Amino acid sequence: PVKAKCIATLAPEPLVEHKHRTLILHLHPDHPTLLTTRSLGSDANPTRQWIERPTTVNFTVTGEGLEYTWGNHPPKRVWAQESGE
């Protein structure tokens, strides 16, 4: 057994949607995709869920940031400061 880099997986890109300190994400994979995040406060408040059924989800993003992992697609990151004027 060797450390080959398999030609490997990739899940379709997400639909990013803005709200006030909140990411609505209409999402639509090919296969069951383990999504997960890390609210970068010292309060981690992570989430995990395999997604195979297309699902609009939500994420209470904080002031300092959140990150977002659409499958083995690379991890995203997001500034959600205010939007409530």
Binding site: P1, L40, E64, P75, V78, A80, Q81
Partner: protein, 400 residues
Amino acid sequence: YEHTAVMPNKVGIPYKALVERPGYAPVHLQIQLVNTRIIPSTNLEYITCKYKTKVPSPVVKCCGATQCTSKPHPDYQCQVFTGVYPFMWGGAYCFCDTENTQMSEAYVERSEECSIDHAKAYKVHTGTVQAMVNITYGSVSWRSADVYVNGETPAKIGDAKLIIGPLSSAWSPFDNKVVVYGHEVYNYDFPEYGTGKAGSFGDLQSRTSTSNDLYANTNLKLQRPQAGIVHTPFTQAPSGFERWKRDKGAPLNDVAPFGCSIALEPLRAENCAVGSIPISIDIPDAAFTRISETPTVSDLECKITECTYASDFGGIATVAYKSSKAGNCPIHSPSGVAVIKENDVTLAESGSFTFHFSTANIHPAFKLQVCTSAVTCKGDCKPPKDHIVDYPAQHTESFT
């Protein structure tokens, strides 16, 4: 002029402080902590992996017993058995019918995947954090050097000597006990070398890959082969490395706090944005410009024109520059309210040049130090609309 500065630990954004040396012209900083890779002190305690019941071929004495001995193989399970009639290619071959004896033996051994696909425990201490700090300094305009955090280490790469930390935010996102797998790192209370219950994680526990000795609590129990046929019932828990790959927990690069990323590399935890770092630099005095050569800018005026109450450098402000000479003029807001994109502004003889910035207070009353000339750029700002992209440049939220 050894410019001490408390400094927030946050990776992807410069920290353009200002050198207020009494006597010569000030110089801006641009300190971008491009990385916060950690590399705690650790110890390889034991690799684990899934077993392989690589059965040695059983003995079959045809008429009478064959006592087994406890060979020193890891988890060497061996049990004599009688009452067989072993069908092997010619029907049976041993001519007795109860004195037909069969001695099954099986030991546990590292898989071939153990070398390569293997979890890996650690006792993790704190160690010492690092960074490839870029400073596009002053007029030097470049140094991208790897540094430490311990508050007496310089790194004379470029021309400047810089001392960092120790940081106050000692949260090692790694716990004391950690399991590691390929790239997914698990802050797991692995039981220990030498103990792991069969089926549970660490049923196989080898010190390293080379280590011929190990601990194999697999509950390997041989049973007698059936109805006078040659084979080896090995009844065994599939590994706690088999599970731990599909009934596991989530990875620390997906559950950590305070903003870290991970690698199976020196076991760093990159970019952990938390707390502050007391950083202090000894600039090369040659890089300074004497005060009598930069234009004096006073008798000026500053005002916002479209302040954006935001993260991206949306805040702007014209400045009625009132110079004496003409040239460059480093700039900074000593108040942390306003973070400015421009370190330096060019000046003709008393012109005007807008800069960009970002704030967090509706009424930004921040001083601006245009190369030894302070000014309040008071005003009012507007909220944006479009907030779903990576991390800010503002990082200055307070009471507003």
